[PDB]
Design an enzyme around this catalytic site. Structure first.
Site, PDB file in Angstrom:
ATOM      1  N   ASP A   1      -7.963   7.867  59.652  1.00  0.00           N
ATOM      2  CA  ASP A   1      -8.430   8.412  58.381  1.00  0.00           C
ATOM      3  C   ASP A   1      -9.183   9.737  58.553  1.00  0.00           C
ATOM      4  O   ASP A   1     -10.286   9.895  58.027  1.00  0.00           O
ATOM      5  CB  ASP A   1      -9.259   7.383  57.600  1.00  0.00           C
ATOM      6  CG  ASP A   1      -9.372   7.678  56.104  1.00  0.00           C
ATOM      7  OD1 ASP A   1      -8.688   8.615  55.621  1.00  0.00           O
ATOM      8  OD2 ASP A   1     -10.158   7.003  55.436  1.00  0.00           O
TER       9      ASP A   1
ATOM     10  N   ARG B   1     -13.826  13.727  53.505  1.00  0.00           N
ATOM     11  CA  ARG B   1     -14.830  12.749  53.053  1.00  0.00           C
ATOM     12  C   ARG B   1     -15.499  11.997  54.219  1.00  0.00           C
ATOM     13  O   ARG B   1     -16.575  11.434  54.037  1.00  0.00           O
ATOM     14  CB  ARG B   1     -14.213  11.764  52.034  1.00  0.00           C
ATOM     15  CG  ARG B   1     -13.206  10.823  52.686  1.00  0.00           C
ATOM     16  CD  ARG B   1     -12.463   9.875  51.743  1.00  0.00           C
ATOM     17  NE  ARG B   1     -11.253   9.380  52.415  1.00  0.00           N
ATOM     18  CZ  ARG B   1     -10.056   9.968  52.333  1.00  0.00           C
ATOM     19  NH1 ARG B   1      -9.877  11.014  51.537  1.00  0.00           N
ATOM     20  NH2 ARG B   1      -9.024   9.490  53.018  1.00  0.00           N
ATOM     21  N   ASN B   2     -14.825  11.944  55.393  1.00  0.00           N
ATOM     22  CA  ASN B   2     -15.295  11.250  56.576  1.00  0.00           C
ATOM     23  C   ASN B   2     -15.940  12.163  57.620  1.00  0.00           C
ATOM     24  O   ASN B   2     -16.237  11.708  58.719  1.00  0.00           O
ATOM     25  CB  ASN B   2     -14.166  10.415  57.182  1.00  0.00           C
ATOM     26  CG  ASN B   2     -13.698   9.347  56.226  1.00  0.00           C
ATOM     27  OD1 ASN B   2     -14.480   8.783  55.443  1.00  0.00           O
ATOM     28  ND2 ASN B   2     -12.412   9.040  56.263  1.00  0.00           N
TER      29      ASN B   2
ATOM     30  N   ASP C   1     -17.425   8.736  59.908  1.00  0.00           N
ATOM     31  CA  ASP C   1     -17.013   7.410  59.438  1.00  0.00           C
ATOM     32  C   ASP C   1     -15.826   6.885  60.237  1.00  0.00           C
ATOM     33  O   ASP C   1     -14.875   7.625  60.486  1.00  0.00           O
ATOM     34  CB  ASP C   1     -16.634   7.442  57.937  1.00  0.00           C
ATOM     35  CG  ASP C   1     -16.205   6.091  57.380  1.00  0.00           C
ATOM     36  OD1 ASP C   1     -15.004   5.741  57.507  1.00  0.00           O
ATOM     37  OD2 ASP C   1     -17.057   5.384  56.832  1.00  0.00           O
TER      38      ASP C   1
END
Ligand SMILES: Cc1nc([C@](C)(O)CO)sc1-c1cnc(N)c(O[C@H](C)c2cc(F)ccc2N2NC=CN2)c1
Length: 291
Positions: free
Chosen positions: A146, A150-151, A167
């Site tokens: 992923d 956003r991570n 993340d």
């Protein structure tokens, strides 16, 4: 108790550094379990496990603590420790004052009141920083699954910022539903066959590069997840972000090769980002100014 293996070593919850609960103070909420800014003084981000949770939620929380604590790299968020012997359970991370990369790009976009708040070099430095983190994961045979804006997190809002992968939720899950899989960041063999290799992160990195050079736009503008799946399966690729220099867009299109064997590894991606950083025709390009 669950076990975890990385870089030749097996670890358990006994290896996690337990921080005395009395030494931990919460300061404010950051976002969603809930995440708080805290202090141990050491400034921390406190990831909490809801006291009302299933046994699978507890195992996932313990697994993410083991995953992050076992990494050692300048572009991967540090884990200061955990507080598992008190409720609610905590995972203590390095507080990245710049916040998440997606929010930073959206809030720091050049505007008439600040037309040079960001330049092509700032974006290239963020791209290099995350590619260095990805290269570390690749060489240690860890597949993120992923890689997305956003991570990612930033150490500070200013020019000296360092970007890090913050993340590891998706990787933890695999170590649940279709509409939750990040299909816009996945290569065809991943969403079609469930095949994940180091070349999965290369494709996702290309999508993150688009997110960065677009200054925080959602990938595949106006397309839904099924439309993206059909588009990408048919050979469709995103257009360059606004004002994106050709050498940078070329890295994205190489990351999006249909065959995993035709995608570059992270050592090659870093060489190409470094070449872009040196090229005056790239770094002298002004980013668009949002009115
Ligand atoms: C200081 C700071 N400000 C943030 C804002 C509110 O998103 C604005 O950028 S994140 C953040 C922030 C700073 N340092 C962290 N170690 C952190 O970790 C949390 C767990 C996190 C890690 C990620 F990789 C991505 C998102 C989040 N958050 N963000 C919201 C809930 N979890 C968040």
């Amino acid at each position: 108790n669950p076990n975890y293996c990385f870089a030749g070593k097996t670890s358990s919850i006994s290896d996690l550094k337990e921080v005395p609960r009395k030494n931990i103070t919460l300061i404010r909420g950051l976002g969603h379990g809930e995440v708080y800014e805290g202090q141990v003084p050491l400034q921390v981000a406190v990831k909490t496990l809801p006291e009302v949770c299933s046994e699978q939620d507890e195992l996932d929380f313990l697994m993410e603590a083991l995953i992050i604590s076992k990494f050692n790299h300048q572009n991967i968020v540090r884990c200061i420790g955990v507080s598992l012997q008190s409720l609610p359970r905590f995972i203590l991370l390095e507080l990245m004052a710049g916040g998440d990369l997606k929010s930073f790009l959206r809030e720091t976009r050049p505007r008439p009141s600040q037309p040079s708040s960001l330049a092509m070099l700032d974006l290239l430095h963020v791209a290099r920083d995350i590619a260095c983190g990805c290269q570390y994961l690749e060489e240690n045979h860890f597949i993120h699954r992923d890689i997305a804006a956003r991570n990612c997190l930033l150490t500070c809002p200013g020019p000296g910022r360092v970007a890090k992968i913050g993340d590891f939720g998706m990787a933890r899950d695999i170590y649940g539903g279709c509409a939750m899989l990040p299909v816009k960041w996945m290569p065809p063999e991943a969403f079609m066959e469930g095949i994940f290799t180091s070349k999965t992160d290369t494709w996702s990195f290309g999508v993150l590069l688009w997110e960065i050079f677009s200054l925080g736009y959602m990938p595949y503008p106006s397309k839904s997840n099924q439309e993206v799946l059909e588009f990408v399966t048919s050979g469709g690729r995103m257009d360059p972000p606004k004002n994106c220099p050709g050498p940078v867009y070329r890295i994205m299109t190489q990351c999006w090769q249909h065959q995993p064997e035709d995608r570059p590894n992270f050592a090659i991606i870093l060489e190409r980002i470094e070449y872009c950083t040196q090229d005056p025709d790239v770094i002298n390009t002004a980013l668009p100014i949002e009115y």
